[PDB]
């Protein structure tokens, strides 16, 4: 009775974990995308300045 519950719990925990990790994946992905844009911009500014001079 115990063993079935034990394995059932293991499944449950491991499922919910996949979900929690997914949420965090999404949060850092949006941050990544914004950060990517910022790098492009900072580089772009350097180029603009160079062309300007």
């Amino acid at each position: 009775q115990g063993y079935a519950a034990e394995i059932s719990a293991r499944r449950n925990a491991m499922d919910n974990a996949s979900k929690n990790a997914g949420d965090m994946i999404n949060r850092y992905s949006i941050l990544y995308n914004r950060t990517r844009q910022a790098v492009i911009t900072n580089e772009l500014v350097d180029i603009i300045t160079g062309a300007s001079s």
Binding site: R34, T41, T49
Partner: protein, 85 residues
Amino acid sequence: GEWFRDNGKHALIVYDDLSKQAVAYRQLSLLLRRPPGREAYPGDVFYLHSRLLERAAKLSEKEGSGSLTALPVIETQGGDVSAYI
């Protein structure tokens, strides 16, 4: 607002939205070929905002307690308060 303020009379001013002023000053500056500041917003943007904001005050008793409350309304970029403006 300052005419009211300088009557000592109490006032309030809401500046909605200075974020759109930033884009405007950006446009003007870029079209004046002034080098892009960070986030492409000019380097004197700090100066602009500070000059605007600091003219709103609760004056001294001599000046008749000239209130002019300031409430500037900022449209946060994606709700990220880390952002230059």
